């Protein structure tokens, strides 16, 4: 019983973290086998991050201008290249702690764990969701760049995020592990802002299911709704439209609880219209949207 914002155990990722320095700039890198991945903006000068040309900045660098360190210990760079917004540094020895892994690009609304690091050392781990607008509501200080987000399936780490920047609102932006940004962001210090964000409807519904598996069921009602009628209301409240695919995904949770998906939608409709009236669900006074249906099934079983 109980329900917590739970992250994946971070050990498999901890053993991959290193420090990458270029001149006076240090940030985090991810060391897998014989390669280190880090944000390319590690090569940028101060008054230079305004309008950088990375092709131009990189050609001026040699393997030996990169200082890579695993804890105390320098790792010799024997190669380097740029892949989109990432640098890939070949080093002259392999990381025996490299887990089984893959690189994945996640969809907005999905969740992942972030190992926040500074100077190549772990600070903490937390779970978050990729917002519909491609930002993350993270906790990053200066020097946190190059920290990664990931999920773990059995013994396999799926890396999905590397941190690059903070936006004016104080939300965070970054790339997949091929260096392609999530969202319309670029790695330069200009005026860019997060787009309109919505509440992740699919996740709220999953979380209502979690509550029911947990015996919090005051919010249920005798009504059902059509998909269309639900969307008419939810969209007034800045919720992402619900699709039949999303309905289908909630099948298993619906079967477990004997609550029809559209019946739960009806419950959510009333919660939105009337509010919670001082009540709480799974300890919360707001509707939580950073748990996917898979997250719910994994934690509640």
């Amino acid at each position: 019983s109980g329900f917590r914002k739970m992250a994946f155990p971070s050990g498999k990722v901890e053993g991959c973290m290193v420090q990458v320095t270029c001149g006076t700039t240090t940030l985090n890198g991810l060391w897998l086998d014989d390669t280190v991945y880090c944000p390319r903006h590690v090569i940028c000068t101060a008054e230079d991050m305004l309008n950088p040309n990375y092709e131009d900045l990189l050609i001026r660098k040699s393997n030996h201008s990169f200082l890579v360190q695993a804890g105390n210990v320098q790792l010799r760079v024997i190669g380097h290249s740029m892949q989109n917004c990432l640098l890939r540094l070949k080093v002259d020895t392999s990381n025996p702690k490299t887990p089984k892994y893959k690189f994945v690009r996640i969809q907005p609304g999905q969740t992942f764990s972030v190992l926040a690091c500074y100077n190549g050392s772990p600070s903490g781990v937390y779970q978050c969701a990729m917002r519909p607008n491609h930002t993350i509501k993270g906790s990053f200080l200066n020097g946190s760049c190059g920290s990664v987000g990931f999920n773990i399936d059995y013994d396999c780490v799926s890396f999905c995020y590397m941190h690059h920047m903070e936006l004016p609102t104080g939300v965070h932006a970054g790339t997949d592990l091929e260096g392609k940004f999530y969202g319309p962001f670029v790695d330069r210090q200009t005026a860019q802002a997060a787009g309109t964000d919505t509440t992740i409807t699919l996740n709220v519904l999953a979380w209502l299911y979690a509550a029911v598996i947990n015996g919090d069921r005051w919010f249920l009602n005798r009504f059902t709704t059509t998909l269309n009628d639900f969307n008419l209301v939810a969209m007034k409240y800045n919720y992402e439209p619900l699709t039949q695919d999303h309905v289908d995904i909630l099948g298993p949770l619906s079967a477990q609880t004997g609550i029809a998906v559209l019946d739960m939608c009806a419950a959510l409709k009333e919660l939105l219209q009337n509010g919670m009236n001082g009540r709480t669900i799974l300890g919360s006074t707001i509707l939580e949207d950073e748990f996917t249906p898979f997250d719910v099934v994994r934690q509640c079983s």
Binding site: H41, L167, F185, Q189
Partner: peptide, 4 residues
């Protein structure tokens, strides 16, 4: 935007 700030490159963090």
């Amino acid at each position: 935007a700030v490159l963090x």
